Amino acid sequence: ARAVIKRRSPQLWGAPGAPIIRMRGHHVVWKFQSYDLVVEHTHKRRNSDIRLLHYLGKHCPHPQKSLWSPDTPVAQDRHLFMLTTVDIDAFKYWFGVKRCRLSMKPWALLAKAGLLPPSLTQNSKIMPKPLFDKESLMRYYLANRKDEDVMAREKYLNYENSMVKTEEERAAERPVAPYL
Amino acid sequence: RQIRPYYNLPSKSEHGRKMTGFLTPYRHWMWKQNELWRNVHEAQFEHLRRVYKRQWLESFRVNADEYIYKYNITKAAQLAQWECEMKEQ
Amino acid sequence: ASLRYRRPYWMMFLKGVDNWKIYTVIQQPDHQRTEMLYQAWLGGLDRPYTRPKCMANQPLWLSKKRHMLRKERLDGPETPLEKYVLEWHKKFHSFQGTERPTPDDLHTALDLVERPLDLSYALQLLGQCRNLNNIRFAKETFLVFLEACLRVGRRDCAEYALEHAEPLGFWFIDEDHRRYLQGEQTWYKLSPLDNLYYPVEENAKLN
Amino acid sequence: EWLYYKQFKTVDYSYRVIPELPEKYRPHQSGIDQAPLPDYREINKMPQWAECEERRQSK
Amino acid sequence: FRDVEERRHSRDVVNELPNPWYDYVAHALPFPDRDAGYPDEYGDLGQWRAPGGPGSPVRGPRGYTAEWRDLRNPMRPPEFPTPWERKYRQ
Amino acid sequence: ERGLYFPINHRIVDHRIAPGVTVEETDVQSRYRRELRTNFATGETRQTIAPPWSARERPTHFFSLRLPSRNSVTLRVKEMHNHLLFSHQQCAPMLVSPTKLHITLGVMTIPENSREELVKNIQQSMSETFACVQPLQLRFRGLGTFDFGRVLFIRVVPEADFGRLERAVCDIRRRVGGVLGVDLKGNPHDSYVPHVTVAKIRPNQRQQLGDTIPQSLWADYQHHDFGDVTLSTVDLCRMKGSPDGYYHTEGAVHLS
Amino acid sequence: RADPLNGGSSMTLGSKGSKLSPEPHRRRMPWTAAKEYVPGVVLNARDKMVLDGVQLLDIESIDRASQLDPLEVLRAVVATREYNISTGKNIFQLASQATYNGRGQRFYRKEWQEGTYDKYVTLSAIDFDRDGNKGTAYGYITFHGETTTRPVQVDFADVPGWYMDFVEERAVPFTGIVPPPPSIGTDVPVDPHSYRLKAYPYYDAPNPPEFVERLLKDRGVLPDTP
Amino acid sequence: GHYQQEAFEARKRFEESTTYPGPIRAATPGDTRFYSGSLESILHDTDRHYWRAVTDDPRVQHLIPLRIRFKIFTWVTSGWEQRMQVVQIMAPKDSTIAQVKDLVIVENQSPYLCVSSFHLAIDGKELDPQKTLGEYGITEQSQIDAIEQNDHLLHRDDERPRDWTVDEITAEDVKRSPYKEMEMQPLQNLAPRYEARPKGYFGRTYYSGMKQS
Amino acid sequence: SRRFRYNTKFPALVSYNKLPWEVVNHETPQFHMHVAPHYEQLLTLAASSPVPHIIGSKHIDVPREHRLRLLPGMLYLLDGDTLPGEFTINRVLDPTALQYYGRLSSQIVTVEAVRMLVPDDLRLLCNCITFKGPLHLPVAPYASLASLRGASSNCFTLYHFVRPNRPPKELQLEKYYIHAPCVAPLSEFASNSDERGNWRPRLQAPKRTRRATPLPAYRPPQSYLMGLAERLAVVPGGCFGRRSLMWGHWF
RNA sequence: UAAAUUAUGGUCAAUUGUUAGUAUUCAUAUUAAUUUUUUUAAAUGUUUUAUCAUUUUAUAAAGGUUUAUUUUUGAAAGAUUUUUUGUAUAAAAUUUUAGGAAUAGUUAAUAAUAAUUUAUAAUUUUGAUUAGAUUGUUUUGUUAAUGCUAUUAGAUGGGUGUGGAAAAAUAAAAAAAA
Ligand SMILES: [Mg+2]
Ligand SMILES: [Mg+2]
Ligand SMILES: [Mg+2]
Ligand SMILES: [Mg+2]
Ligand SMILES: [Mg+2]
Ligand SMILES: [Mg+2]
């Protein structure tokens, strides 16, 4: 909605837009370069701190030898290490409750961590993208579909309330003799 | 961006853009397929969205009411302390 | 890519207007006397004049007055037909006309032909009744047109109307009218009152 | 496409059409006078084909 | 896709193992649960002070009471004759 | 150009209109500072308000401090009448004669059957309440309105012995309305606003006079100072206007 | 907002759609409402090479020296007519030819009858402006054997994409009133032999094999040799 | 709706109470003119700018804030628009509809409204200038329109004002009425510069309740 | 988009961004556009259950004085054709107007005539619609219209009074959307009907040995298309339905 | 007005100039800097769209401000079948010049008033207004240390007023609806 658009760094919608989790670091020689996982708005200003919701972490893209742990004859442990600090309470808050967006590189990271499934942009160019036809899918679905109530209860436990009360803690929480 | 291929409906105009997005039926079918695949991705994605939402809410319940436990005890203590200091006063 | 933020809000959905930036700066005094001069250049007014505040287009009344003060051509009408064509442009080409011609007005128009010049005129009227105005004809329309192409002694246009009648939009041609142009029937029509065949030279066999 | 838009002074290359404002944007200030009034009798002289068809009308 | 995946996921035994990252949110509250090493009312660093002292939040407060009975004279032989070492009771 | 671009007194949101209405559908225009014009400016005063059942019945008797002879008050009210009548003589029926001027300490409804028990009992309780109170010097300045500008009165300033009045009144209030149940037009746990009623519009009058006393009359006397008076005499009065030429007096108490 | 694509799922900006909702996203701009539009540029765009070697006149050139052979005028008219149908036929070009200005006839656009898309418009009435080829056209929309309750202005009546089929049964005189055609579920009892439903709310079409061949020959599953 | 009859009935039962002492005005606060925020907000008279948890006794409303609707012709650059302007009075409970007309005439600050005689009406039915609001069941929520003399002539081109877009404005009428005030001929700062909405704002068909396409 | 809270931006007096107030002109076709689909609903009601003021015996008569505080909004039905007194008569022959009465004339009583009646003083209106023949709906015995000779002499008229140039509110049609059941289909099983013995139940679904005939093979459309109607937020036809279900749009 | 112990606890304050009778923080010292060196930046064409239009894309030009800069969700986030709410624009503190005097579309009440409403008005020696210099309240250097000595940059009026918000006329390094 700017009369003469700022041409180089366009976005979608008005700024500040919905918060997006980005990786960003000042540019330098490749030997020292680190990145910041940051929840911030869609439209950045000159200094990235002006719109910054939260600071999620440091990520160093240099494979490192592990000198912190003792040298271990185990094969896998002596592959190089890649270090990252995730703040996952803030991540689950922002992503889950506040409904963030995600750039692709942080997505790859958080996929490695086990917080998210691997991204849309991670492609083994070995396999193609799948085909689809509705009648075959339908045969498979009629073949396997679970009961309605089972499914409803699964959606209940995953989305709505998890912690529930067994009859036991009811019986243990209900008042005894003098006020019963 | 929205990809505009060369076999999209060419607009013959000198007063404007050379190519209008209008699709060969093939392109439409194709687009539908690709987009089905990414639907497969975003299903799990938003599933995880609301899952983490209830996770965070639940942890908030438990820790926050533990907090209210400890805190209320604290302010009850302070208040007792004060009314005592005022009896002394 | 919309001009929303480039020009004043009232200019939205502005199309066809020549160099619209003009009407942005018209408030400034020099642009304004420029426009006084321009309106005087267009003429049709008594007084120094300028179009109102935010208007890019000229006012409806003004351009209407420009249109009605514009002198029509053909200052010499001789044939009744030319008179009627001037009246035709008066009625149906009037600025922002609601009204539209009728097949009867075209018959009337087409019956006044004498010289081939008038055939050209009536035929261009017909051209406007098909293409410009989109008016369905009647059966007797080709009758009229045909006898009209006979009056001037040019039968080329009649058979040229036959070989393709779909673009010209004659939706009914009685088969005998076809024969007359294809040469099969010496005569196109018989006048019941006359009990003779038309035209008269073919009727020379009837005698 | 881009070559076509390039002829416009659009500052951001935004695919909008923005015209210019010449010092003389209207006929009267470009020196042009009023459009010359048509001689009416001269254009009402019947054309050649009409005269030829009058010649074969009298025949 | 979801169904095939749930299937081969439930089929493997290395799953059904709690994943600390996937399962919960340790702490949802913006403030910490206990005080860690932040400067004090005097401006002194975390390393210079131990929490729980005089800066901490206050703890607050005819016949005989129930605390009268539990008490007993050291002159009378106690409840269960636990063999205390003399040196220690000294 | 001679002030703020948007004068601060003109910035007003009406929350008693639905949300979204003023943005799109229509705009609402009103002169909003007639309503916002305050209780000091209008001269209104909030009297103890009656419960509906009590509001139904006419009041019969009232407590009054009787103004002595030779008052600053009576004199200045006479001066005020002169001025008002010279300005607008349509006031003439509104005005209360200087003969009837008295301080109204509270109003009450007594039913006609229990009449004597109530007057004797009241009179007695009254005499006990005021036993210890010596005379009261009170200050009068300012005007105010009761009952939507129908009643126009002289305020009693809380700058003086007024304090004592307030306890005194609140005692009879807790006896007359608390002890023996009597209809005081308000709650007995609430204090009445003492006043000297100057102009009044009765129900019958209201048709020819109008529904409210125009503020243009008394605007200038609104803050006028009527002076100080010492008061030794408390009455319980029934309201009859022809018996003695002064409100008919059922009981009396002397402050000394 | 009112009707999102796939609920809110934000994992990509493209995941939302090209418009967030059918409803206009700013309230101050109503025309942003989601329609079904048409390629106006191509479908206006009439062929000017049809007017080659013609010698048209203008409206206000009435001059004696100006106009031409009646033969030249006739081929001019035919050239102009061919110039106006040169893309497709506009409603008002179809309606003037039909009886009663084509009241009652069913006007379908080309793309409405192909694929699982089935839709047409029964004409309620017509206003010809002085210029034909333009105007206003009102009618009932019938989509998959389900019809509108009241008439509506037909959108894109001016764009030349329209076909129809003249039937004497459907003709209505200007005196009477064009009835809305019955919605096949309600007014007329549903019959299989009379009308079969092309597609229904949860249906969609099977894969045409040439598209499949092409997409695999694209993604590089099925080989393609130069 | 439900509120109206719930509170009406509540008031009506409150009035039939044989035993009530009456409220204590030290326990029944007024409202504040002093609260945070720059804007001055006018509220319901049952409501306060502070937090009051307790429900106060139902009171009869002696000043009823009537709303009276008018039609204005607003000049926007493209041409005239017909839109709605509400005038809001505070009319005493027992007031007569004549008096409501009078209060409404005094309260309007726009030069374009009250020029001729107007009649108050509810859902198109005229009101007696003679009788009370009580009889017609007029409340704040009630919808009151107002109808001018020439308003039933507005379907013509005469009474409806003429926009300089399509109509001659002459030295006759340049000196008279909203035209004169408007200053049609553009000035450097552009004169009073009115709101503008473009021609293609609603599409080819203007604004409607019913979707026409 | 939601409606914003309040306008503090622009002066109220000037009123600035305001949706125009819609007003119904009686000279145009647009009038009937508004009024027609109401009438049909109204008549439908009259066919099922009684509504009080719908049916008058004779033309209402009022003084000049009380004319405009009584009439406006009034809607009543009469048996014959008699046109209200002191009303100039306008025939509605223009086809665009007639057009909106289509549904009402096909699926309810045939419309014989329409009339716009304007008072001499010009400030009042009467829309008069003359129906011919019996209802194409079934008429209940206890229903209002059962008291009328024109239904169930075959012509009868609807009369609707209104002020000109008013919003399409204060023509009062919206009170009539009370919905009563047509009891015609169950009239078969009442103890009153002698065809109730000709009825036989189907309790169990019949054994079926054949599947439904398969739809004709799908031809992919050959022309250019505007793209996914999903992503363009176009409801399935540009007609009705939800944008999530893309059924019946091309593919 | 009494000592204390169940013993180093609660996590490091520590100062370096070779001068010249004496009095006074003053040349030559260390650390930090400028003098001083091309191992971190970068090139133009933003992009869709329904076609002469309409949707998306909101704070690095200058001017010199010390009682000074303050704000919403109606955009997006954003999830339902439609009417949906209320909260905001206001303030308080901290404010420089060696030698010091008056400032002014002007205060407060009224009100959608007043280029002539009403009034004994408002700012200032507890330092004003003009005028100089100057980019304001987590950033540096020295030091054992209350100090001294730095901290960029970025909000410059209105005039058809679009937009949720003016932040709207080169100068990115923000992926901008497959
Ligand atoms: Mg939203
Ligand atoms: Mg700047
Ligand atoms: Mg300065
Ligand atoms: Mg300050
Ligand atoms: Mg401030
Ligand atoms: Mg400027």
Automatic annotation (TrEMBL), chain C:
GO cellular component, one term: kinetoplast
Protein name, entry field: Uncharacterized protein
Upper lineage: Eukaryota, Discoba, Euglenozoa, Kinetoplastea, Metakinetoplastina
TrEMBL record, chain D:
Location within or outside the cell: Mitochondrion
Family: Belongs to the mitochondrion-specific ribosomal protein mS41 family.
Full protein name: Small ribosomal subunit protein mS41
From TrEMBL, chain G:
GO cellular component: mitochondrial small ribosomal subunit
Source domain of life: Eukaryota
Listed name of the protein: Uncharacterized protein
UniProtKB/TrEMBL annotation, chain H:
Any Pfam family the entry gives: ubiquitin
Gene Ontology cellular-component terms listed: mitochondrial small ribosomal subunit
Domain named Ubiquitin-like: residues: 66-147
Domain of life of the organism encoding this protein: Eukaryota
Protein's name according to its UniProt entry: Ubiquitin-like domain-containing protein
Gene name per UniProt: Tb03.48O8.680
